[PDB]
Structures are given as structure tokens and as C-alpha cells.
Structure 1
Amino acid sequence: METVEMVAIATVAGLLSLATVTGNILLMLSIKVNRQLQTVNNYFAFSLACADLIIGAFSMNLYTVYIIMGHWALGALACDLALALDYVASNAAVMNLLLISFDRYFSVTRPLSYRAKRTPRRALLMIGLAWLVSFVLWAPAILFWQYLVGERTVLAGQCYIQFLSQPIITFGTAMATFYLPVTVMCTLYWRIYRETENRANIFEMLRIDEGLRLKIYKDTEGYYTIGIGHLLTKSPSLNAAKSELDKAIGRNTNGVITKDEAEKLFNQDVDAAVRGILRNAKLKPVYDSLDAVRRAALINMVFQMGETGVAGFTNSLRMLQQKRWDEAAVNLAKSRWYNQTPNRAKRVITTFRTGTWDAYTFSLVKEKAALRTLSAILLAFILTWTPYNIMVLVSTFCKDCVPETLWELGYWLCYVNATINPMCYALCNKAFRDTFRLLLLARWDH
């Protein structure tokens, strides 16, 4: 190729590599230097940054030299090893995105059961298996295909994957590395968004009715409580309540906690309440029949009265499962509950009557940094890997239709995912953005 083309491509690919190596190092150092970033989900982000660092420093630079030189000069053994390192790191990134998606899925859908298992030790176990599965699946086929076929069909001065020669096998790998992971992650995201907004509404409902307290207080029984009726301990000690609070959050709070930390505790209490409802033979048929809004009004009653208290409304529960909401509203209002808390009872009864949030006046979806990051890193994956996967799709129906140049650009677009991944964290998380700025200004300072 021309000397002018060699300089132009080397500069663009070089600057892209520099942006990839810098961004993923900044992401890794951020989790290392900042304690507030040292969360179980950020262990997977560190693992993803490791895969993206190989892509930036090794894959990108070595693939660009291969295109510029127009041939492979390092030999057949260096070639297959280079391709093995490349494919395993690229798949490890996809596996890490699946780990981020599943962790976010189980922590939102199951805040009680899953957070018993959500320790850093289990995150490290899942990270290692993800990297090991990527290796066991792609490296043996990359290196030993030539021995199983009986010949190395890749010429000297050429470096490419031998088993990806036929377009149907390329499509097979595309299904396993793109089409199936994307489908799985999208289905997981629709469930995470629906669950998050559903739980938020229960949180905002009880914030109006029961009340939210950021500091440790004593309940009616005299036990230390926090947030929306979250029991810390039954022990008559302030320090014991503080120790149990620091255990539940993971930091030295010393009495005071944030709204988001109180929401985390409340969602464990919602899971504990729903566990009791399904285990109660008198509350299970009505709960299964009610919609998301009317289920929350039943949970509201469980948080105030208790399991057996709501079960006392034999007449009312029967009319709610029969979808006769005007009838059940009359029986619910004619009780000791309505007389004790008239303002709260009317709001809950109206919720059962209408099946809407008109009694409370609710705000739109508060898209938390974690939800925004997941959506950004998933869209980043779809955007950068779509060109190559469309080329694979047209390759199956069109033999040798895709030119050498297009494959080279489609390969380079897949690597751009590694460049834009730390940008997604910076754009969605304020704690990452500030640490990125902090580390960059600290590096410029000698």
C-alpha cells in the first residue's frame, strides 16, 4: 500500500489503541484507589476492563501491523497463539457482560436470597470460570483445527482462523458469541427495568404511608429500627443496632444512612413480606390474582398489620380475587384499621378500587447509575459488533461477497467496544467520572 495510507492508518489505529489502554487502566485504577467503587458488581467491571486492556494493547496494535505490512512475518506458531489470545479476550468481554447482566438481574429480582450469595469471593469464582470457559471453548479449536483437518490451509505470511473458513461455522460462532448473548441480555434488561420501577412504586407508597427515617429510631415495641420499618436488632443496645446496620450496608454508617441504602433494606423486607404471603394459605390465592399495583396495596397492609391481620379480612380477600373491587372496598373501610389510620387506609382502599397510583401522585422512573450503565454497555456491544455480524449473515447467503477491506473494518469496529466501555461508566456513574479526572490530573502532576 501507499506511504500516505500507511501513515494515516497507523495514526488513527494508534490513537484508538492509546484511548483504549488509557480508559481501561483508568477504570481498573478507579476501583483500586476508590473504596466506594469496591462493590461486587464492579469486580466484573474490573474483569471486563482486563479483557479490554488485552484488546487495546495487544489485539489492536498487532492486527494493525498485520494490515499495514500486508502479511504475517512472525511465523505459524506465533500466529495461532496471537489468534488464541485475541479470541479468548474478545469472548471473555462478552462473558463478563453476561456476568454484569445476571448479577444485576438477581440483585433486583431477589434482594433477599441473592444478597446472601453476593460476596466478593463468589464474584471472583464467577470471573475465573468465565475466563476459563472462554479459553476451553476457543483456544483448543484455534490451535488444533489444522491437526484434526490434517492440513494447515492458512498460507505462510497469512494469519487467520482456520475453522471459521466455511460461513455456516462462522454463523454458528456468531450465534454463540453475539445473537444468543444479546437476546439473553435484552430479556434480562426488560425484566430488570420492569422490576426496578415496580419496587421503586412500593418504596414511594410506603414512604408516604409509613414514613422514611435516615437515622436509627425506636419503634412501638421499643426495638431499634431504620428506614421504612426495618428491624436492626431486638437487643436493648444502640451500639448493637449500629453493628447490625454496618453489617447490612457494608460501611461505618454510625446511625445515619442514605435514601438508596434504606431502599436496599426495604426491598429485602418486601421479599420477606411476599415470602410470607405465598406461604400463607389464606393470602396466596388473592395475591396471585391481583395485578402489580393491587399486589403493592396488599404488601402495604402486611407491613402495617402483619400476616395474620390481613388474613382476618376473609370477606374482603374473596371479593378482590373475584375482581369485585367496589364490593371489597366497602368491607375494608368497615374495620378497626380504617378507624386507626383513616388517611392511609383510604389511600390503600382506593388503590384496590382503581388499580392505579392516583391516591399517591407518583414521579417517573429514577434511572439509577447501575441501570443506566447496563443499558449503555449493552448498547455499546450491539452498536460495535453489529457490522461484523451482519457481514457474517450476508456471507452465508452470498459466497465471497464480503470484501477483505470490509472484514478488516468490521473486525476493527468489534475492538472499538473496548474503547467505548470505560466511557459508558464515566458517562453514567459520577463516582467513576470524578476518579477518572482525579487519576489523570494526578498523572500529569509529577
Structure 2
Amino acid sequence: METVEMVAIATVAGLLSLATVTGNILLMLSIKVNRQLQTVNNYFAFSLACADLIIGAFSMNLYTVYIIMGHWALGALACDLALALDYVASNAAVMNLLLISFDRYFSVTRPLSYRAKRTPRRALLMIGLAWLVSFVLWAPAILFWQYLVGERTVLAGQCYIQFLSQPIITFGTAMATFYLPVTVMCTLYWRIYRETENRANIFEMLRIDEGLRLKIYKDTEGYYTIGIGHLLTKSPSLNAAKSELDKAIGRNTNGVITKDEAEKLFNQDVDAAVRGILRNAKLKPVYDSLDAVRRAALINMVFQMGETGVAGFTNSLRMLQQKRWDEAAVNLAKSRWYNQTPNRAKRVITTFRTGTWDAYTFSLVKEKAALRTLSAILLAFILTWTPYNIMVLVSTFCKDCVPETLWELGYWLCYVNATINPMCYALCNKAFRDTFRLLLLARWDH
């Protein structure tokens, strides 16, 4: 290799390493330095940042020395240990994306029953096991394959995994580290998106009908409440209500909360109501029969009158599961419920009639930073790891088809995932972008 090429690769690969080290350090420090970022899902973001910091600092720079020198001059032990660090960190990154996806999946689908398991202690447990499973998966086969075969077939001046020499084995590892994780995460995301728009529609429906209060108030019974009828305490103390609010939110609210904190509290309530419906023998068959829109109209009724109240509408409930909506609408209107809240009752009854949201005027689903970040990091993994996995795919159908130059470039693209991951957080999350900016400006000063 020419000296002109040596300096150029060193500068470009060196700046890439610098951009990767900085970005993942900013991500780790942002979570450390900012309280608003100290959340359960960001424990996984920090864990992912640690894996990407190893890729940037170690893997990238060692790969550069290997390319520039044209051979491996550090010995077989140094080779096998460096391969172990590289594969274990790359797999720990994939396993961390799986932890982010699953946590986000359960927190949206099961907000009540999962956010009782969703502690920083359980995040740390899942993180450690992800790093341990990653090590136990790659490191023993990297170091001991030569001993099971009876020969080290990797030549001196060469560094690669011996068991990956056959393309089908490499394809097997690609199925387990790319194809299956990606299919699992895409399926998890489509469920997360569908649930989010479903839950947002129930929130906007009840916001119109019941009303949203961002400050502590008293309900009809005189108990302290917040949001869309979220009971804080039965205790006749405002400080007891404020303390129960801070325990539920995770911050010193002082009796005032945001719409998103009021939506999170409402989604636990939807889960509590849906648990009741499925446990009630009179509401369970009708709810199972109904579609997503009519399910929300039943939830609306439950939120207003209670479990037994809605169960009192025996003939309307029968007509709704028989798909005779015009008939069900007649019986629902001839009630004390319609007489008290005519505007709200008509809107609910129309929802049961049409099966649409026409009685209300709903906006498209507001994609929150969490959903957007998840989609961005998933697309970042698919984009940067696709070239290498296509190269693996074609190598199974054609022996030595893939040029050495292409393996080299596809490996570099895998590494680029570690560079673009902190960018996904900065583009999607305002709090990350401002903390990254704050930290960079603070470092520039002094």
C-alpha cells in the first residue's frame, strides 16, 4: 500500500472513530447529567452507547491498523481476543436494540401490569444478561474452535473467525444476529404503532367527553383527582394527593402535570377498565365481538357510569354483539344517561352506530420522541448491516464471489451504525439534542 493511501485511510477512519467516540460519550453523559433523561428505557440507550463506544474506540481503530499494515502483526492470541471483543460488542448492540423494542412494546400494550415490573433494577438485570449471553455466544467458539478441530487454519498475518470459514455457518449466524432480530423488531414496531394510535383515539375521545384537568381537583365524591378522572387518594389531604402524584409521575409536580403525564395515567386507567370488562360475564362477550372504535365507545360508557351501570343495558349489549347497531342506538338513547349528558351520549351512541370517529374530529397520531427514536435506530441498524448480510447471502450461492474490498466496505458500514445511533437520539429527542449542545459548548469553554 502507498504512503498517500496510508495517510488518507488513517484521517478518514480516524475522524469516523472520533465522531463515534464523541457521539456515544455525549449520549452516556446526557443521561448522567440530565434528570429528565434518567428513565428506564434510557438505561438500555446507555447500555447500547457502551457497546457503540467499544466499537468506536477499539474495533474501528484496530480494524484501521489491520487495513493500513496489510496484515495482522500482533499474534494469534491478540487476534482471537480482539475478534472476541469485536463480535461480543456488536452482538451486545443487537441485543440492546431488542431490549429497547420489547420494553417499548410492553410499556404501550400493557401499561398497568408492566410498569410494576419496569424498575431500574430490572433494566440493569436485562442489560447484564444481554452482555453475558453475548459473551457466552461468541467468545468460547472464537477462542476454542482451533482446539475442537485440532488445527488453527487461520494463517499468521491473518485475523478472522475460523468457524465462520464455511458460508452456511456464517449465514446461520446472520439469521440469528440480523434476519430474525430485524423481523422481530419490525413486528414489535407495527404492534407499537397500531396500539399508540388506538390508545390516542380513546384519549382524545374522553378528552372531549369527560374533560382534561392538568391541576389537582375534587371529583363528585370530593376525592383528589387529576387528568381524565384519575383518583389520586381517598385521603382528605391535598399534600397526600401531591405525594401520591409525585410517586406516580416520578418528579416534584406540585399538583400540576403535562398532557403526556395525564395520558400515561389515563392509559393505566384504560387497562384497569379493560380488565374489568373481560372479568364481567355480561360485558365480556359484547367487548370481544366489537371492533377497536366500538370498544372505545364501551370504555367511554364504563368510565362514565361504571361496570354495573353499562352491564344494566342488557338488550343494547345483545344488539351490539349481533351487529344490529341502529337498533342498539334506540335503547341506549332511552336512558337516564342520555337525559343527563345528551351531547356526550349522542356522540357515544353515533360511534356505536357508524363504527367511525365521525362524531368527534380526530387528528392523526402524534408520533412521540420514543416511537420516532425506536423507528430511527431500527432503520439505522437495517441500513448499515444490510450490505454485509447481502454479501453473506450471495457467498452461500457463490464460492469466493464477494471481493475482499467488498467485505472490507461492508464491515465499515456495520461500524457506521455506532456513529449514526447517537444522531438518531439527537434528531428525534429535543432533551438529548439540547444536552449534547450544552455539553459541547461547556467543553469548548475552558
Short-chain TM bin: over 0.9
How large is the Cα RMSD of the aligned pairs? Answer: 0.4
Q: 1:406-436: CA deviations, max 9, x gaps?
A: 0010001000000000000000000000000
In the aligned structure 2, how far is the partner of 1:175 from the partner of 1:303?
Answer: 47
In the aligned structure 2, how far is the partner of 1:11 from the partner of 1:355?
Answer: 61
In the aligned structure 2, how far is the partner of 1:9 from the partner of 1:322?
Answer: 71
Q: 1:203-239: CA deviations, max 9, x gaps?
A: 0000000000000000000100000000000011000
Q: What are the residue-to-residue correspondences of 1:420-435 with 2, within 5 Å? A: 420-435=420-435
Cα distance, 1:64 vs structure 2 = 1.0
Cα distance, 1:382 vs structure 2 = 0.1
Corresponding residue SS for 1:194:
helix
Q: 1:160-198: CA deviations, max 9, x gaps?
A: 010100000000000000000000000000000000000
Q: 1:105-159: CA deviations, max 9, x gaps?
A: 0000000000001110000000000000000011000000000110000001110
Cα distance, 1:26 vs structure 2 = 0.3
Cα distance, 1:298 vs structure 2 = 0.1
In the aligned structure 2, how far is the partner of 1:325 from the partner of 1:398?
Answer: 61
Residue of structure 1 equivalent to 2:42: 42
Cα distance, 1:443 vs structure 2 = 0.5
Cα distance, 1:261 vs structure 2 = 0.1
Q: What are the residue-to-residue correspondences of 1:297-446 with 2, within 5 Å? A: 297-446=297-446
Cα distance, 1:7 vs structure 2 = 1.5
In the aligned structure 1, how far is the partner of 2:402 from the partner of 2:10?
Answer: 24
Q: 1:280-323: CA deviations, max 9, x gaps?
A: 00000000000000000000000000000000000000000000
In the aligned structure 2, how far is the partner of 1:346 from the partner of 1:88?
Answer: 60
Q: 1:240-296: CA deviations, max 9, x gaps?
A: 001100000000101000000000000000000000000000000000000000000
Corresponding residue SS for 1:254:
coil
Residue of structure 2 equivalent to 1:99: 99
In the aligned structure 1, how far is the partner of 2:224 from the partner of 2:96?
Answer: 40
In the aligned structure 1, how far is the partner of 2:267 from the partner of 2:84?
Answer: 44
Q: What are the residue-to-residue correspondences of 1:189-204 with 2, within 5 Å? A: 189-204=189-204
In the aligned structure 2, how far is the partner of 1:368 from the partner of 1:402?
Answer: 42
In the aligned structure 2, how far is the partner of 1:325 from the partner of 1:7?
Answer: 75
Cα distance, 1:9 vs structure 2 = 1.2
In the aligned structure 2, how far is the partner of 1:207 from the partner of 1:257?
Answer: 15
Cα distance, 1:11 vs structure 2 = 1.1
Cα distance, 1:2 vs structure 2 = 1.4
In the aligned structure 2, how far is the partner of 1:332 from the partner of 1:362?
Answer: 24
Q: 1:359-402: CA deviations, max 9, x gaps?
A: 01000110000000000000000000000000000000011100
Residue of structure 1 equivalent to 2:183: 183
Corresponding residue SS for 1:106:
helix
Q: What are the residue-to-residue correspondences of 1:161-180 with 2, within 5 Å? A: 161-180=161-180
Corresponding residue SS for 2:130:
helix
Corresponding residue SS for 1:402:
coil
How many residue pairs are counted as aligned between the two chains? 446
Percent of aligned pairs with the same amino acid: 100
In the aligned structure 2, how far is the partner of 1:366 from the partner of 1:113?
Answer: 24
In the aligned structure 1, how far is the partner of 2:143 from the partner of 2:81?
Answer: 7
Cα distance, 1:6 vs structure 2 = 1.2
Residue of structure 2 equivalent to 1:221: 221
Corresponding residue SS for 1:215:
strand
Residue of structure 2 equivalent to 1:234: 234
In the aligned structure 2, how far is the partner of 1:125 from the partner of 1:415?
Answer: 27
Cα distance, 1:24 vs structure 2 = 0.2
Cα distance, 1:10 vs structure 2 = 1.1
In the aligned structure 2, how far is the partner of 1:373 from the partner of 1:312?
Answer: 45
Cα distance, 1:46 vs structure 2 = 0.2
In the aligned structure 2, how far is the partner of 1:19 from the partner of 1:342?
Answer: 61
Corresponding residue SS for 2:232:
strand
Cα distance, 1:3 vs structure 2 = 1.4
Corresponding residue SS for 1:217:
strand
In the aligned structure 2, how far is the partner of 1:67 from the partner of 1:152?
Answer: 22
Corresponding residue SS for 1:201:
helix
Q: 1:14-35: CA deviations, max 9, x gaps?
A: 1100000000000000000000
Corresponding residue SS for 1:221:
coil
In the aligned structure 1, how far is the partner of 2:186 from the partner of 2:396?
Answer: 25
In the aligned structure 2, how far is the partner of 1:116 from the partner of 1:414?
Answer: 36
Corresponding residue SS for 2:17:
helix
Runs of at least 5 residues in structure 1 that lack an aligned partner in the other structure: none
In the aligned structure 2, how far is the partner of 1:365 from the partner of 1:379?
Answer: 20
In the aligned structure 1, how far is the partner of 2:197 from the partner of 2:85?
Answer: 41
* TM-score (normalised: structure 2): 1.00
Runs of at least 5 residues in structure 2 that lack an aligned partner in the other structure: none
* TM-score (normalised: structure 1): 1.00
In the aligned structure 1, how far is the partner of 2:162 from the partner of 2:26?
Answer: 36
